[PDB]
Structure 1
Amino acid sequence: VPFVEDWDLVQTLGEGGEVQLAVNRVTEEAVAVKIVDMNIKKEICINKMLNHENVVKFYGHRIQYLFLEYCSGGELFDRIEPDIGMPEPDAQRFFHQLMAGVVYLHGIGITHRDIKPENLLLDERDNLKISDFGLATVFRYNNRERLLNKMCGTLPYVAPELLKRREFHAEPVDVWSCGIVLTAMLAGELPWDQPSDSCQEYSDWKEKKTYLNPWKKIDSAPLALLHKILVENPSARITIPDIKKDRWYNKPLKK
């Protein structure tokens, strides 16, 4: 078929250093194009291993060009109303989808390392897709776990052990960031600048002062889950299999 390989760049999508929408001249199929002038080699290699409904699909690469599954719903960040969040049933559905994507990644030995609402996209049916694997790395290979030591991610979303320890397990760090995402969705506010002993908001949380925001805005059920996720000691922190057994996680919700 002629012209089937021709794509038109019709509009600029987002940051990076640029995300553009490409439409096939013949089929009208759409794809997102990640443009980086120009690290990228690894992002491509990891992307090639991914195949899950809650992870942005990688089509190929042709400076460097990254061709990805187009998510017309944009960033989850934009569905969060400042100081409000979003309806609990919507937050729960997004959280279920986030967990499914994270379980998948962890199952293949990959850690994202930068989970936050700006890196969680939504498709036309509002299905959540984990995006931006520029910081991702392998934490398990040949059934052997490798400890992480590199400090990376985004401050308000990073787990405390990253700041305090020379080495740390990958999985609990991603679990922690998911908890910060859940907090944002339910409160429309991040709980602290960073989980440091010098941060008053973090000290307040460790002291269980849940009568304060953002906690006060969150229902007891999801709050009880957050109490299990945002645990300082990563070895005591709830794991995904246990999150799947949580009361709120399993609560039927409807708007």
Structure 2
Amino acid sequence: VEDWDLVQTLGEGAYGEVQLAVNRVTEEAVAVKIVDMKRENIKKEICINKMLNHENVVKFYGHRREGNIQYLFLEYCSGGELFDRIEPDIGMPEPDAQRFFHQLMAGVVYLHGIGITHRDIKPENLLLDERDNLKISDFGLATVFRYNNRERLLNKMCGTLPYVAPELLKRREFHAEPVDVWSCGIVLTAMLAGELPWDQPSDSCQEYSDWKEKKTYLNPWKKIDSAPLALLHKILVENPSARITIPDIKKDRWYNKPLKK
């Protein structure tokens, strides 16, 4: 009634590889993430996962260790990665991007309300269930940034360069929440344009300098309608203190635009 055949490999998490596992008896499907502690940073992932319960967060069912092998038992999302819904050079229909973005923000508000920062928000880590509902996955790089109501600044560089905020390259210490916001902005750009705007947010990238100089007649920006673009102007702001926060994202005109049946 509860041993699982590992039916196929789904890919790799930040730590370990994920398999689709099917219950021989009940036919129930879960994802099993398999982490070779040999061939602590994983302990934290398990710890963080036990705090989480939200409809836009990949459910954690339990863990079992067998030798040097940690298994984490996670919600299977049969829709796969948001990454695979993004057409290269094209993006996806604006109403689809909006609903995904709304679902992203719900999950991120949730994390940040319990004091957790994800730190590697990108389409490969955003999963779709059978109803195309988005779930945030993979807490391998996640960390506590608020505890007993006191914030701590982050100092370690974590994340994926095209998605990372510029302060994380430029400051010894920085606030966790505007990092996650920025990376949500790069995801929205990807969804609406089917391309990433720069290799990293450095003045050393021409495309990044072009964005700061507001050359929005260039790609990817010219593919994006004026209303979402105006949101991206407020998310992709280099100084993290002047960057829009989630409460204000939720007030944004595109965010609230009716689009989708």
TM-based fold match above 0.5: yes
Alpha-carbon distance in structure 1 between the residues aligned to 2:30 and 2:2: 12
Question: Cα deviations across residues 188-234 of structure 1 (Å, max 9, x unaligned)?
Answer: 00000001111110000000000000000000000000000000010
3-state SS in 2 of match to 1:77: helix
Question: Cα deviations across residues 38-94 of structure 1 (Å, max 9, x unaligned)?
Answer: 211110000010000000010011911010001000100000000000000000000
3-state SS in 2 of match to 1:48: helix
3-state SS in 2 of match to 1:236: coil
Matched-pair identity in %: 100
2:66 maps to 1:64: no
Question: Cα deviations across residues 82-120 of structure 1 (Å, max 9, x unaligned)?
Answer: 000000000000000000000000000000000000000
Deviating beyond 3 angstroms after TM superposition, the runs of 4 or more aligned structure 1 residues are: none
Alpha-carbon distance in structure 2 between the residues aligned to 1:192 and 1:241: 27
Q: Give, in angstroms, the shift of residue 171 of structure 1.
A: 0.2
Q: What is the TM-score normalised by the length of structure 2? A: 0.95
Q: What is the aligned-residue RMSD (CA, Å)? A: 1.0
Q: Which residue of 1 aligns with 2:7?
A: 10
Q: Give, in angstroms, the shift of residue 254 of structure 1.
A: 3.1
Alpha-carbon distance in structure 2 between the residues aligned to 1:19 and 1:35: 6
3-state SS in 2 of match to 1:249: coil
Which sits farther off after the overlay, 224-233 or 11-20? 11-20
Which sits farther off after the overlay, 4-13 or 160-169? 4-13
Q: Which residue of 2 aligns with 1:35?
A: 34
Question: Cα deviations across residues 144-185 of structure 1 (Å, max 9, x unaligned)?
Answer: 000000001000000000000000000000000000000000
> Unmatched 5+ residue regions in structure 1?
none
Which sits farther off after the overlay, 166-175 or 53-62? 53-62
Q: Which residue of 2 aligns with 1:47?
A: 49
Q: What is the TM-score normalised by the length of structure 1? A: 0.97
